[PDB]
Design an enzyme around this catalytic site. Sequence first.
Site, short mmCIF file in Angstrom:
data_model
loop_
_atom_site.label_atom_id
_atom_site.label_comp_id
_atom_site.label_asym_id
_atom_site.label_seq_id
_atom_site.Cartn_x
_atom_site.Cartn_y
_atom_site.Cartn_z
N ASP A 274 0.86 -1.22 0.00
CA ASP A 274 0.00 0.00 0.00
C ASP A 274 0.90 1.29 0.00
OD1 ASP A 274 -2.36 1.70 1.17
OD2 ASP A 274 -1.01 1.58 2.90
N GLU B 249 0.48 -0.37 -4.95
CA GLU B 249 -0.34 0.88 -5.18
C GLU B 249 0.58 2.09 -5.03
OE1 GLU B 249 -1.80 3.00 -2.10
OE2 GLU B 249 -1.26 4.44 -3.67
MG LIG Z 1 -3.72 5.23 0.33
#
Ligand SMILES: [Mg+2]
Length: 755
Positions: free
Chosen positions: A430, A483
């Site tokens: 993340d 991400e």
């Molecule tokens: Mg975020």
Amino acid sequence: ISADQVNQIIYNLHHDPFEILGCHLLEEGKNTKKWVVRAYLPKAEAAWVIRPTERKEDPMNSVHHPNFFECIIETPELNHYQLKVKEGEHEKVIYDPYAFSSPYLTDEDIYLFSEGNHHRIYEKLGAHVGEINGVKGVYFAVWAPNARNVSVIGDFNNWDGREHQMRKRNYTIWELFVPEIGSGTVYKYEIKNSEGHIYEKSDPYGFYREVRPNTASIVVDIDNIYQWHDEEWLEKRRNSDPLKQPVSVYEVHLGSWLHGSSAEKMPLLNGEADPVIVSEWNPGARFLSYYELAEKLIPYVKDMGYTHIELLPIAEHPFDGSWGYQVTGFYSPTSRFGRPEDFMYFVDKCHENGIGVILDWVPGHFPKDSHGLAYFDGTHLYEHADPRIGEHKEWGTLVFNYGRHEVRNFLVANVLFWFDKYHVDGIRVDAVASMLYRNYLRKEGEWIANEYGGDEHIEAVSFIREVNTLLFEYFPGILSIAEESTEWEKVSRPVYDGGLGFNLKWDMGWMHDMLDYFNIDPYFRQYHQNNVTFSMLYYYNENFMLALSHDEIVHGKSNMLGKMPGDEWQKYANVRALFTYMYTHPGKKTMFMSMEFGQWSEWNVWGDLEWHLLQYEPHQQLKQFFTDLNALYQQEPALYTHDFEYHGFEWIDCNDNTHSVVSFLRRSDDPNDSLVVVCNFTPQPHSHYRIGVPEAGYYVELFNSDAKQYGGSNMGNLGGKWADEWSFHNKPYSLDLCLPPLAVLILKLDPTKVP
Ligand SMILES: [Mg+2]
Ligand SMILES: OC[C@H]1O[C@H](O[C@H]2[C@H](O)[C@@H](O)[C@@H](O[C@H]3[C@H](O)[C@@H](O)[C@@H](O[C@H]4[C@H](O)[C@@H](O)[C@@H](O[C@H]5[C@H](O)[C@@H](O)[C@@H](O[C@H]6[C@H](O)[C@@H](O)[C@@H](O[C@H]7[C@H](O)[C@@H](O)[C@@H](O)O[C@@H]7CO)O[C@@H]6CO)O[C@@H]5CO)O[C@@H]4CO)O[C@@H]3CO)O[C@@H]2CO)[C@H](O)[C@@H](O)[C@@H]1O
Ligand SMILES: OC[C@H]1O[C@H](O[C@H]2[C@H](O)[C@@H](O)[C@@H](O[C@H]3[C@H](O)[C@@H](O)[C@@H](O[C@H]4[C@H](O)[C@@H](O)[C@@H](O)O[C@@H]4CO)O[C@@H]3CO)O[C@@H]2CO)[C@H](O)[C@@H](O)[C@@H]1O
Ligand SMILES: OC[C@H]1O[C@H](O[C@H]2[C@H](O)[C@@H](O)[C@@H](O[C@H]3[C@H](O)[C@@H](O)[C@@H](O[C@H]4[C@H](O)[C@@H](O)[C@@H](O)O[C@@H]4CO)O[C@@H]3CO)O[C@@H]2CO)[C@H](O)[C@@H](O)[C@@H]1O
Ligand SMILES: OC[C@H]1O[C@H](O[C@H]2[C@H](O)[C@@H](O)[C@@H](O[C@H]3[C@H](O)[C@@H](O)[C@@H](O[C@H]4[C@H](O)[C@@H](O)[C@@H](O)O[C@@H]4CO)O[C@@H]3CO)O[C@@H]2CO)[C@H](O)[C@@H](O)[C@@H]1O
Ligand SMILES: OC[C@H]1O[C@H](O[C@H]2[C@H](O)[C@@H](O)[C@@H](O[C@H]3[C@H](O)[C@@H](O)[C@@H](O)O[C@@H]3CO)O[C@@H]2CO)[C@H](O)[C@@H](O)[C@@H]1O
Ligand SMILES: OC[C@H]1O[C@H](O[C@H]2[C@H](O)[C@@H](O)[C@@H](O[C@H]3[C@H](O)[C@@H](O)[C@@H](O)O[C@@H]3CO)O[C@@H]2CO)[C@H](O)[C@@H](O)[C@@H]1O
Ligand SMILES: [Mg+2]
Ligand SMILES: [Mg+2]
């Protein structure tokens, strides 16, 4: 080796197999060394020594007996290798079982750790069951180079460490052997710092931990607790290119999928434990164990037809409400759900069911809690000392010093640990931006540039590239997903090409475009046709994963149905159209729990999902929709073989903004696997809507999201349509379709249909 030595091994007469099995130095040359690796592999016909970090593989030869193997290798150091072992028609890849003849740290282990390159450091740091001086017990070791003293405190000494003070080696690592204790021992390290202040620390390399909010480490005999059955899964993984397969991910937060009753014990794999209550405010509910999740989540997933389960962070974390993103026990799966072996069982059962496991992994920061890694030894040890690069002040957390060798080693070896000990099939990281930028969430005059004047966090970029290089060398065929929300280039490209080395990146732009689009009243979507088509412009710069994640159905964003305009029928229809489009658009797929059955409320991490909705038809029908869509996705090669090549996609037409219609082709290796996809993003049906197609013949309707069994109005083309010799969209043939309202059609030319 002699035949006599061989036979002593084969017939279990040798006094110590470590004297001849494993890796042994034969001689030193000027710039290199000569080594032999030996293995006794009953039932194997062939074996190889893999040196995955050098990209080499050497056959082993049978020597005196068909199951006794030797391999002679010249290289300066032989620290990093694996055995590939062929038994009949099956191959497995393992670490050498004779790699480490003692539980204590060797000189070599300390040297490799000091340099940041001990890929197996967790075999020696932490707590391990073994034998020293002829007596069984536990060896403990911890890195704390500035501490003034460290002791082991635990159940076995009533938390008094005075007769268990550790010995410091090489000014860096403390150790101690404790006889006659074993797995199940509860302990901490008591550290005194340079000030003379005394505090208690959980084991950074601990393998199991008390249930939050208690934080003592627990000893685990991690190689003798579970018997795996997933060799064939692992072999197919290692021999496959996951980028060319269907990847349909069900994203799950284990603590909030389904709860049990706290009025009973938590069942475990052949045992039980006290219940872990979900919260003080909901005291009648308990978490499900990893064992119960294997028995319930896995067949639920298998029946829905997803290929993978992606878990929100399961590393040990003290606060439910961080969702797992603030980890303090990096080497242990959270005790909320039971024991290490219960999680091993979960993963083995996924693999038996042909489902892969992706773990959210959190190398970006760690919280301040006093039991954890912060200020570990009375210095800034894990974190960088300068808060301008060592703290994420907006989050209240600390940032690892990726440049510091032993810190880098903690994290690199941790990634490998999950693949080694728990057999997982991928990781997702993340907020990669949070590591890549020295100015991340920092104001002017509160951060400092790198040595060249830039904002690039050099040490972090080098760490990420190392992770990804090693992960793919040691475990080919895995997923490494990022991400990254800035415009950092080459995220999902090889390190050798200047990339960060991931193999997939979440398409956050696509996600925003879609959810913003669908939130627009349908009459107005004509002004925002570009949301539909835009992401295909930059699409080929990365390998994209299309993710509609947990982050999108909290904090006032609504769940999927609630994002959509119109009455109840239209809200459902919008959800079907969006997801049919997502599954036909190029890229791999990820969706979060609750989205597959139309939960109305937002995800709430403190309760479980609203399963009672599945008593009602509209929810059942949406769940059947996803079941059938996942089945189609796995059955149609054009939906997954060429996601990342031009050949796999072409728009037919996207100029009809005023009706919010788009259409396109998907292709695979076989031209007869080509698909035609047609999307109608308003509730106005169309009755004789022409779409160009590249060939004559009958186009079977494989899927229609307006079918009545999915909750739709049952408009459609009655099963399929013959194409006309009527040029259209610059193609020589065309179909005259009925376009159902707020729906997507998937058609496929059947060239054997009878005219
Ligand atoms: Mg975020
Ligand atoms: O993924 C889920 C699911 O999707 C697909 O299956 C869906 C269909 O997409 C959906 O259309 C529907 O099809 C069922 C249908 O409801 C059943 O009734 C039956 O259909 C029979 C039909 O009843 C018979 O009459 C016969 O139809 C003749 C037809 O009578 C004849 O007139 C001509 O039709 C042409 C027509 O004259 C033209 O006007 C035009 O019609 C258009 C209109 O212009 C338009 O405004 C609107 O009303 O729709 C009309 C339909 O397009 O074109 C017509 C040619 O298509 O020729 C037909 C050919 O027979 O035959 C059919 C075939 O038995 O069965 C169908 C198929 O099951 O519901 C299903 C299920 O929800 C996918 O096929 C399925 O695999 C997937 O699971
Ligand atoms: O016996 C008294 C001696 O101890 C003191 O030196 C200490 C430091 O205070 C410790 O923090 C540590 O220093 C290590 C460090 O732990 C380690 O990571 C490595 O440093 C690298 C770094 O990883 C790399 O990124 C780059 O910046 O280079 C660094 C330097 O190599 O090694 C450090 C230095 O050894 O350990 C030593 C010994 O415990 C005291 O300050 C000494 O003067 C004294 O002799
Ligand atoms: O022959 C029947 C009709 O077929 C076609 O009508 C279509 C509409 O064009 C589509 O938009 C859709 O209708 C949805 C509608 O969009 C949606 O709002 C909802 O409307 C319901 C509502 O659920 C209900 O509670 C009540 O108020 O009645 C409304 C009925 O309209 O649900 C509709 C679907 O049930 O699909 C229909 C049927 O295909 C064609 O365009 C019409 O001319 C024709 O009458
Ligand atoms: O009764 C209404 C009409 O229904 C049928 O027409 C349909 C077409 O079959 C559909 O394809 C669509 O038409 C689109 C077209 O697909 C789309 O490309 C765009 O066309 C632009 C074109 O791209 C541009 O190059 C230039 O030539 O202008 C074109 C006209 O704008 O937009 C079209 C729709 O506006 O929908 C129509 C219905 O509106 C049937 O074929 C008709 O004969 C029938 O009258
Ligand atoms: O059955 C009595 C008692 O058992 C359990 O408490 C244990 C803790 O959960 C465990 O952490 C450990 O506590 C030690 C701390 O970790 C340590 O930092 C230091 O402060 O000393 C503590 C022990 O004094 O051991 C206790 C006792 O086993 C259970 O959770 C208790 O609530 C229960 O009352
Ligand atoms: O062959 C070149 C290119 O064609 C296709 O791109 C189309 C997009 O898919 C679509 O959004 C649209 O692009 C415009 C933007 O939407 C708009 O916001 C702004 O930036 O202008 C863009 C430039 O036209 O139209 C393009 C061009 O047809 C296809 O999707 C690509 O993969 C392909 O490389
Ligand atoms: Mg816009
Ligand atoms: Mg509930």
